Design a protein around this ligand. Structure first.
Ligand SMILES: [Zn+2]
Ligand SMILES: [Zn+2]
Ligand SMILES: [Zn+2]
Lengths: 48, 400, 80, 297, 106
């Protein structure tokens, strides 16, 4: 899923890079920018 | 002009004055057509002749004629609305006869004509509704009125309707706020329609006022009035309630239509079996003539009450008092004073003259009236030959 | 007994220089009072307010309502 | 170092809130009764973002940029998701508004479940539109209102096109739906257009015999009202006002495939009226109001 | 009753329009034949009415709605075959049952 992020910028996920306030681990998902790369912690429902 | 002036001076007191005047107009128009063929210059001549003969008259007589015109229009409107088969014929005759009366456009009688039309239009709009008839008649003869007061009345009614809608929405919003407050912290009736009037356009009398509403009307109605007053303030101009209006009452199988004074008297009657007039007067604190006019159509035939003067029970009626027409047996004094002051200011300001609008400013300050009143006095003095317009500057008023 | 099924209450609403330019009512026009040498005559309208022809000319060229009472301005041509 | 930070923070905020929007959307798709609770969550997110902006961003332009990003990131896909038809054809907001209109009658007792339901729907819709001036949110909400109105009117028409109360009940339905739309979305013009379009569509989606019967009914109603208002007394002066009110729900025929039959049937009755009484004021006024509904004048 | 009569009239009008003017074509033809049979049955039912009751009325309304939707789709079109054959057989059986009930009633 290529999340729009502006007029000429989209995003797409790459791969989990870790695991770690609700007792359930997060996921430091990396996001590739298609016109750098953003790192974002996402919760399990959110990533699902 | 000679013919119509002869007629005017001959019969201005008889009650058939307006029908005879209109018949005269129709006959002279037909005769002019039969003589000179259908042309426009001759229609203009006819209108100018009528105008000249009207103007060449006295002030008391001009006032009488204006009152008569207004009364005739009102009678025709009322009859055409109420009656059945004859009412349609009457409305036809009226939409015909409205052309002779437009000869009052631009003259020095239009102000008095309008000031007398206002009263009758007010009584009509408050007894019946803002029927399409008033709108049609005004689209026909709406230019005779200098200040355009009747159109403002008709606009006031629509403004009141919009106010009703906004009031409903406002009440809903208050309820929503209160429900949210109570939720977050935790986590068979009389329809009343209110009508707001603007004293710039309605001639409400300073005798038809309700000062302390709570001491007269029941608690429920007083509460409704208070709620609307709160809304008007929180969205605004105060609000002074009046005894005008109408109401629908149920009495047995009978449905009655009454005025506010009538409704209030009868409601008070609904907790006893006989009422005394002196007590009614003392408790109401209103005009006794008004009380009598309100009571008259009640003790009469087919009435729900009986007289004995004590008031008792008699054992779709329309018991609304009919319109008591005025009778022109102070306008002359006002015209005299305005003319005198205007002549004084015109003589003092130097033969260089002054501008007419600035002149109205001066006259209003000196009185400190209406711009239309001063303008009509100016037209009167110009006709009578006491002032003139500067040929070089038409806006310059030069004394003669 | 009687039962009120409808009612229609009536209520009146009750509460002076050239407000638009705020100069004195009989005085001259401030726009042209800056450019000394006073040509604005007063103008009247059906809605019964008196304003300067200069003020009104400009304002109307901008907007098309009476700035004091929210009605379409109509240049008074009675008695004229 | 300002533009670097501007770009980076805009990107981060936009992405975070798009992810959260899809989360809430997939949550609301499962159980339709979740919008009543969707309102406070939005309130919290907006309050937090406004607090942050006011405390750590000086330029009003900077604040406005952050706010526009947050809004167009969270509330736009949420709308385009909750107002998208299923296979049967009922969206979440469509279901909510339909239930509002259906339970509106029993929502007068200020202590009942219907009162709370109505309050919640009202607040949610006002929030969703509180930022309008054609955005991509107002458009979706407008189409949703159109669909709800069309379904209601289609149900009514297919239900009672025979009873002699057809025209009065039609006009009462018009007034009801108009007041409801106003109290939900505030007084706006696009929503009145939506109402008119819904009524017109419900009319068009009909058969020919039924269209003819509806047209004859409208014409007969106008004729009866005019005759009564002219002839009777106080009842007639009362009827003419209701007639004046009821012409706007009939003007919806202005420019459809029914105007021809409506006119062909209005002719027949105007003839008898004009040859029994004269060309009164009433005919002229009625025509000055609803004139453009006739193709051939 | 008014809703059922309006639905029957609309279905008859749509069928007349389709008659006046390749698995998809065969499926549309089968659906049109079934809709014509169901419309004939509904016309007979309305004629009998004009000259588990709630459950029967709900079933009749659902069948009328299904026939109208199928006819509207077929007009808009211009496993699946087993489903169409089963629907046509059920429609014919319902028509025969309604005819038998009418003959028993009068
Ligand atoms: Zn000024
Ligand atoms: Zn000036
Ligand atoms: Zn004004």
């Amino acid at each position: 899923l290529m999340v729009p992020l502006g007029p000429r910028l989209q995003a797409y996920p790459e791969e989990l890079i870790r695991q770690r306030h609700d007792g359930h681990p997060e996921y430091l998902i990396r996001w590739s920018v298609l016109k750098e790369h953003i790192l974002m912690w996402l919760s399990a429902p959110e990533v699902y | 002009q000679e013919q119509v002036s002869r007629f005017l001076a001959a019969a201005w007191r008889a009650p058939d004055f307006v029908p005879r005047y209109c018949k005269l107009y129709e006959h002279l128009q037909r005769a002019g057509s039969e003589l000179f063929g259908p042309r426009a210059a001759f229609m203009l001549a006819l209108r100018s002749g009528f105008s000249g003969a009207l103007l060449q008259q006295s002030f008391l007589t001009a006032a009488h004629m204006s009152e008569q015109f207004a009364r005739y229009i009102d009678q025709q409107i009322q009859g055409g609305l109420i009656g059945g088969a004859p009412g349609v014929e009457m409305l036809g005759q009226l939409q015909r006869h409205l052309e002779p009366i437009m000869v009052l456009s631009g003259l020095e009688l239009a102000t008095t004509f309008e000031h007398f039309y206002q009263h009758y239009m007010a009584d009509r709009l408050l007894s019946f509704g803002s029927s399409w008839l008033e709108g049609a008649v005004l689209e026909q003869i709406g230019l005779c009125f200098p200040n355009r007061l009747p159109q403002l009345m008709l606009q006031s009614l629509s403004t009141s309707e919009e106010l009703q809608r906004q009031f409903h929405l406002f009440q809903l919003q208050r309820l929503d706020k209160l429900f949210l407050e109570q939720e977050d912290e935790e986590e068979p009736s009389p329809a009343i329609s209110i009508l707001v009037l603007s004293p710039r356009c309605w001639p409400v009398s300073p005798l038809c006022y309700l000062y302390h509403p709570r001491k007269c009307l029941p608690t429920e109605f007083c509460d409704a009035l208070d709620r609307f007053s709160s809304f008007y303030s929180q969205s605004q101009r105060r609000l002074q309630w009046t005894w005008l209006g109408r109401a629908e009452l149920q009495f047995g199988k009978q449905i009655l239509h009454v005025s506010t004074v009538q409704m209030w008297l009868l409601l008070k009657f609904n907790q006893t079996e006989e009422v005394s007039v002196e007590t009614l007067l003392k408790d109401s604190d209103l005009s006794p003539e008004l009380l009598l006019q309100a009571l008259v159509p009640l003790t009469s035939g087919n009435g729900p009450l009986t007289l004995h003067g004590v008031l008792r029970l008699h054992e779709a009626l329309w018991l609304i008092p009919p319109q008591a027409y005025l009778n022109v047996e102070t306008l002359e004094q006002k015209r005299n004073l305005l003319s005198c002051l205007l002549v004084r200011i015109l003589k003092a300001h130097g033969e260089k003259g002054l501008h007419i609008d600035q002149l109205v400013c001066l006259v209003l300050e000196a009185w400190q009236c209406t711009s239309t009143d001063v303008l009509s006095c100016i037209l009167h003095l110009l006709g009578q030959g006491y002032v003139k317009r500067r040929d070089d500057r038409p806006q310059i008023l030069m004394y003669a | 007994r009687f039962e009120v099924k409808k009612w229609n209450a009536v209520a009146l609403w009750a509460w002076d220089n050239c407000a638009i330019c705020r100069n004195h009512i009989m005085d001259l026009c401030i726009e042209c009072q800056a450019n000394q040498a006073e040509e604005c005559t007063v103008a009247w309208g059906v809605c019964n307010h008196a304003f300067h022809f200069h003020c009104i000319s400009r304002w109307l060229k901008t907007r098309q309502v009476c700035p004091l009472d929210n009605r379409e301005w109509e240049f008074q041509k009675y008695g004229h | 170092f300002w533009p670097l930070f501007r770009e980076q923070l805009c990107r981060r905020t936009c992405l975070f809130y798009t992810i959260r929007a899809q989360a809430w959307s997939r949550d609301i798709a499962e159980d339709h009764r979740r919008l009543l609770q969707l309102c406070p969550r939005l309130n919290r997110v907006l309050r937090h973002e406004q607090n942050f902006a006011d405390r750590f961003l000086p330029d009003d332009e900077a604040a406005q940029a952050l706010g526009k990003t947050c809004w167009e990131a969270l509330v736009s896909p949420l709308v385009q998701n909750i107002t998208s038809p299923d296979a049967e054809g009922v969206s979440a907001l469509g279901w909510l508004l339909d239930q509002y209109l259906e339970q509106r009658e029993t929502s007068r007792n200020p202590l009942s479940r219907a009162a709370s339901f109505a309050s919640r729907v009202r607040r949610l819709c006002h929030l969703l539109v509180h930022v309008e001036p054609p955005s991509s949110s107002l458009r979706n909400i407008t189409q949703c209102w159109l669909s709800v109105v069309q379904e209601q009117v289609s149900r009514f028409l297919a239900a009672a096109w025979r009873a002699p109360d057809f025209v009065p009940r039609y006009c009462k339905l018009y007034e009801h739906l108009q007041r409801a739309g106003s109290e939900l979305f505030g007084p706006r013009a696009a929503f009145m257009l939506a109402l008119r379009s819904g009524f017109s569509g419900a009319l068009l989606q009909q058969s020919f015999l039924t269209a003819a019967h509806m047209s004859e009914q409208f014409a007969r109603y106008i004729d009866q009202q005019i005759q009564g208002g002219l002839i009777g007394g106080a009842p007639g002066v009362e009827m003419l006002g209701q007639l004046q009110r009821h012409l706007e729900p009939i003007m919806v025929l202005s420019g459809l495939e029914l105007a021809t039959t409506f006119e062909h049937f209005y002719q027949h009755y105007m003839a008898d009226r004009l040859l029994s009484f004269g060309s009164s004021w009433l005919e002229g006024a009625v025509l000055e109001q609803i004139g453009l509904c006739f193709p051939n004048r | 009753y008014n809703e059922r009569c309006t639905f029957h009239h609309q279905a008859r009008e749509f069928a007349v329009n389709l008659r006046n003017r390749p698995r998809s074509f065969t499926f549309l033809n089968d659906a049109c034949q079934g809709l014509e049979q169901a419309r004939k049955v509904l016309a007979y039912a309305c004629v009998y009415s004009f000259y588990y009751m709630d459950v029967v009325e709900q079933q009749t309304e659902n069948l009328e709605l299904h026939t109208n939707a199928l006819q509207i789709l077929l007009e808009e079109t211009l496993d699946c075959l087993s489903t169409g054959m089963e629907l046509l057989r059920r429609i014919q059986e319902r028509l025969l049952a309604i005819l038998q009930h009418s003959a028993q009633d009068f």
